[PDB]
Ligand SMILES: O=c1[nH]cnc2c1ncn2[C@@H]1O[C@H](COP(=O)(O)O)[C@@H](O)[C@H]1O
C-alpha cells in the first residue's frame with residue numbers, strides 16, 4: 001500500500017514515513033496547498049481540507065493538521081500554531097509565559113484519510129509543559145520548548161524514534177494504523 | 187567530513203558532490219557493485235543495498251535510487267525505470283499512455299545513509315504529468331516527456347539550472363543535509 005501525504009512539512013513527512021514504514025506502507029509526499037479554515041477545532045480544518053482536495057489529488061491520500069494548546073493562554077496558539085510560530089515565534093511564546101504559575105499544555109494531531117469516496121479522521125493527544133528556554137535541535141516547530149509528560153527532555157532533544165513513541169502524531173498514527181488493520185490490505 | 191558514495195554513475199556523483207560540497211561535505215565515489223533487488227519500493231532497494239554493503243566499504247557511506255512512477259500505469263516503470271527506458275523507451279511509454287486522460291506522474295528519489303551502526307533514508311518527490319509527445323534536448327532519460335507541476339516545459343526543455351530547482355534528487359539531498367546538519371559534527 002502507498003499513501004499520498006498532502007503536506008509541505010518535511011518534519012511531518014519523516015515522522016509519518018518512519019512510523020508507517022515499519023509496517024511496509026509507503027508514503028509519497030505531495031505538496032499541494034489547500035485552504036486551512038479558521039475554526040474551533042483541528043478536526044474542522046481537516047474536514048474542509050479533505051472536501052477541498054478530493055478529486056484534485058491521487059488516492060488514497062492523507063493530510064494532517066496539528067497544534068500546541070497552552071493552558072494558561074486559554075488554548076492559544078492552538079489551531080493557529082503555524083501563524084503564531086511564523087510571527088512571534090518560540091521567543092514570543094516564552095515571553096508570554098514569563099512568570100506563569102502553570103506552564104502545562106498539550107499537543108494534538110489530527111490525520112485526515114480519504115479513499116474511495118470515504119473520509120476518516122484519526123487523532124492523538126500528548127500532554128506536557130513548556131520549557132523555560134529552547135533546548136535541542138532535532139524535530140521542528142515548537143519541539144525546542146515542549147516537554148512531554150514524564151520526560152526531562154524536550155521533543156527537540158529526542159531522536160525521531162523517541163519522539164514518535166511519545167508524541168501526539170505517533171498516537172494519531174497508531175489510531176490510524178489500528179483502523180487500517182481491520183479495513184484495508186497492506 | 188567525508189562521505190563515501192557507492193555508485194558507478196558519473197553524473198550522479200557530480201550532482202551529489204556539488205550539492206553537499208556547498209556545506210563542507212566531501213563526497214568520495216567508490217565503485218563497489220552491490221545488489222539492487224527487484225521491488226515495488228525504492229525504499230526496499232535501498233534498505234537491501236545498505237544492509238549488503240555494511241562491512242564491505244568505508245564509513246560513513248551513501249547510496250541512491252530513483253524512478254518515474256506513472257499513475258495510470260499503476261506506478262510503472264518505477265524501480266525499473268532504467269531498464270524500461272533502455273527497452274521500450276519513451277516511445278513505449280507514450281504508446282501505453284495513448285488515450286489516457288490521467289497523465290499524472292512523479293519522480294521519486296531515495297537516499298540511503300549508514301553511520302555508527304544505523305541506516306537512514308531520505309526522500310524527494312517531484313510531481314508532474316506525461317506529455318503527449320517528446321520535447322526538448324536537455325537532461326536525460328524521461329526528461330523529454332515529463333512536465334513538472336507548475337511549468338509548461340518538459341524537463342528536457344529546461345536548462346540544468348531550471349531543472350535542478352525542481353529536481354526530486356535535489357529535494358532528497360536537501361532533506362539529507364538538514365538531517366546531517368543536526369546529527370553530525372564537522
Ligand atoms: O510535532 C510537532 N512539533 C513542533 N511543532 C509542531 C508539531 N506538529 C505541529 N507543529 C506546529 O504546529 C504548526 C502546524 O501546522 P498545521 O498542521 O497547519 O496546524 C506548525 O507551526 C508547526 O511548527
Ligand SMILES: O=c1[nH]cnc2c1ncn2[C@@H]1O[C@H](COP(=O)(O)O)[C@@H](O)[C@H]1O
Nearest residue numbers: 250251252253267268271326327328329
Ligand atoms: O531527472 C530524471 N530524468 C530522467 N530520468 C530520471 C531522472 N531521475 C531518475 N530517472 C530514471 O530513473 C533511473 C534510475 O535512477 P537512479 O537510481 O537515480 O540512478 C534512470 O535510469 C532514469 O531512467
